[PDB]
Amino acid sequence: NLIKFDDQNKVFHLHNKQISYLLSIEDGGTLSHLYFGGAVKNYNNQLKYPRLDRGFSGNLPESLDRTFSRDSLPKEYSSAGEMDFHTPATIVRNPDGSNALFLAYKSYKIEDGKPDLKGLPHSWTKEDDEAQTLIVTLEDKVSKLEYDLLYTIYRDRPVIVRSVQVHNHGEEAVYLEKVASMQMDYVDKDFEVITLPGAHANERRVQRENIGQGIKVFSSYRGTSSHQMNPFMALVDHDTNEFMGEAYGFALAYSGNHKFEVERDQFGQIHVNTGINDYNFKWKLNPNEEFQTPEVLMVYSDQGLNKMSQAFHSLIHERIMRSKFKDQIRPVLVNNWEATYFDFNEDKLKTIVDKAKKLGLEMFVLDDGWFGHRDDDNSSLGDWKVYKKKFPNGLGHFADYVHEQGLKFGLWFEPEMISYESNLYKEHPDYLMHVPGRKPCPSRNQYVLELGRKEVRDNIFEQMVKILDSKKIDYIKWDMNRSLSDIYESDLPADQQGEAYHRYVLGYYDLLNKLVTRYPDILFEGCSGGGGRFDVGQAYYTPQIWASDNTDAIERLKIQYGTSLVYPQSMMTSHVSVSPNEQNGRITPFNTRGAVAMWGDLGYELDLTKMSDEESDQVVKQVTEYKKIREVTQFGTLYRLKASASNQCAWMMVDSNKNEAVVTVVNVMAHAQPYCTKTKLAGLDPDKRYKNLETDEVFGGDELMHLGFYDPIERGDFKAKMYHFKAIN
Template identity: 70%
Template sequence: MPASFVKKDEDAETLIITLEDKKSSLEFELFYTIFKDQPVITRSVKVKNMGSETHFLNKISSMQLDFVDQEFEIITLPGAHMNERQLSRSKIDQGIHTYASNRGTSSPQMNPFIALVNHDTNEFNGKAYGFAFVYSGNHKFEVEKDQIEQLRLNVGINNYGFAWKLNKGAEFQTPEVVLTYSDRGLNQMSQTFHHFIKEHIIRSRYKDMERPILVNNWEATYFDFTEEKLLPLVDKAKKLGIEMFVLDDGWFGHRDSDRSSLGDWFNYDKKFPNGLEHLAKYVHGQGMKFGLWFEPEKISLDSELYRHHHDYLMHVPGREPTPSRRQFVLDLGIKEVCDNIYQQIKRVLDTVKIDYIKWDMNRHLTDIYEADLPADQQGEVYHRYVLGLYDLMEKLVSDYPDILFEACSLVVADVLTLEWLITCLRFGRAMILCC
């Protein structure tokens, strides 16, 4: 999983508190890391089964924090597609208040972040406690205010549909929570997060570089294009001083609409009879960079991948899987599925000079079931999917560190998780032109 890092050991120090439940023989390690240059603490928990019996984790938080005799308001960041991170601020009344997502991956509907603030806190004055969950799956923030004005905060993986089987000797690591405190309002809290993300989350070589001005063919052509039709767009882009041309959806399989070919990451010969590398060479010959569109987590029923591997599609046996945007979800919790997609993308990247990848993800998870897991491990599907996605991404950015990745409609790319994707959106110019 993604997590904070330091360049030198002396830049941070970690306290590990070990707790043992003697009855169950479970051991809990509570991790507290403080940073030399940032007013930040990170928290996470590791659970180990030290006994001989199997246990099931039905709920496991990454952190718990109690406040006594403080009157707070809560700030959350709900939203929707193209209306992300809307600021919501409300008083915390007595009872349990939950801010969560169970869509399978984090989303614009509920960002994995909250802040606890005093009623008079504004941008530049007042106290603010910020909590950001470094995880791209189902999350849950629970805020409970009791009858004597005490407040308890729990942050962790959403326990909806979650049950992790912990066999003898096995362990489970929770994602990190990043905590910060500001005594000078929301602006100081925001700046702390920005600096921390840049210095201790983002690993990409592009984090301090300016972003190229690009043109994307999507609104100009949608699926109706050939190489011949795209060349005038490239020529016009060069005259305008645009620095990169991005080929969007429709270059692969036999994709002429959104009904087919997701999962078939190979050249569509009808559109590119000379191969995709021919277009890439033309773009580079014009002095521009070349980018390409992918949506690696999805599959179409009309695809070579589905015809050969029905079992790759995430679905409940005996039930019709649920389409959204005429597409279905690949079961990335299965290693063979991730390996197949990785090898397909690798063949493209090894034969075509790609400078930039536009990574799309246009729907959430449904039909939650993993074919290669027994019945007593189906509660692991959500988390295993996210781990598989992380593994796929890690392989790609490690093997192709010179490619710039952009998140497009990517519901898993919240500000603290897929750090290598957000670097193209922060700390530099990011102008995207759609003809």
């Protein structure tokens, strides 16, 4: 079917109509990486690695053959202690104090479907014939450890998914100091590497670099996937762009500390590892226990970055996300945060609800400040009960009002966190994450809960269920506003404190999973001070995520473009906010804020009651137009057309039958003497005829893609134009 093992040449071949992945068993049972790329029907031993005596690249135990070395061969995995001097995929500490591991091929199996990953998010299948999974087992015969390397291929996608499971079949514990989810080594490739660095209010700009000898590391230590470096990278040809050239993308399905390593070695080979960061990672694996890594999604495109992205979008949306809302149009909501910050009460919010109804909005989301005595960000996290001074008749009274006005109701929570000034801390001070004897460091004047402890998760779960069981809350914004700094888990022995970071993430996933599965009828939006936990692991739980606290239309071009390299546009949310912008002071046209906020799932986040009639009618118009196009903008195939560094940013979405397209083009800096520019479309049927719904003119798909059209020339910075095309019969 999709996976074959040739027991004569010792070669495994995963293939479909799009891709082939080839690996082999080499001397000493060494698992070698041969190829990943466009599909081939057969393999005939022509990628056997040349045998050369390479100075200082040593040999197998007891071997006299100097021309084979685990330090030169391209491999599917590696360890410390095996005569390999690359950065190793795994490191084990044994009872004798050594870091020795020497893995050798033991066995394989080929299964239909793919296995569920215990305690972790993962891609899945709806029917077993959708995919097959090869599991290759490697063993160390001295320490009695086994490593299972999982490889899944879907029948109709250019994707390989990899993870690792470690098993201790010995008599004593070992400590896992590093366990990568995968390793792949390329020969004779001269790639550039694309990543998505950033910061708070500045996430996921596209960065592209040459690769020199040495190791380039893209990672997080913050206990989250982070604002500063997304858990993603792509390796591309120098000449790859959005529409042509090869690209290998790698996205780690994990929401904690990650590490992507790209090493160009002494023989010009490019060695890649991806997995949980090894920083303060030391997992005690007792006899008869197992450790499962998160998985990595690997995409191959033979025709540019849009095709790569589209494969991630489809896999994430169709076979990772589990929400019942993933295929439902997302509501046009208003969120009060930038509108009021903490300065509100029920009467104030009711006026916003009234205005939202008149403007045609579909949901009101109550943001931070509704609980405990939360007058600012210096108290009350952990006290998930209504602030009576703000809501004198309780929270249900307000939710009922929202529903009576014809809107859905959403509510913000920050379940992982605790304030010193909280009843929770007064009752359970040991729930706050710190190293005993050391005052912890604050961040936004708050601290992190010990979510690795079941009793701590149970407390928060019971508080939330007491609100949520009423079914008055249709939507939850689940936020998380600081990194982890004081790394400890108070119920673990000293020798297990290297488990604290990963147990925190496991605990987060357990609590979140319990809530999203109890409440399939609630739309969950992830948040972490914006996009600080914006990853494929998170998608499994929340089908949309607040992309950034930066709501400036213009900086959002950069953030949304980078986000879309991996993540489907329905997974990112985008709100029209006030001008001048609250984060950078930029002044933008209202129409430009709307256009950029229709790339993600549109919402509004400004005090609607302060708008003039002229501005309010503009909201009505934006909302009315978005409702006509949002099935296509939220779920259509995304093509990025122009990047903001060109002075324009442009993108479009096309429905699955290529019958409808919505295109947006934004010009950044105005010029007194501008060059004429054209926009060309993509993803259309060259033989269909498309009507421009604004002008009623009709153009062949071939014309729209090859000729394009001239962009309007207007004065003023930060101007946008949208186009809507529909195929005629």
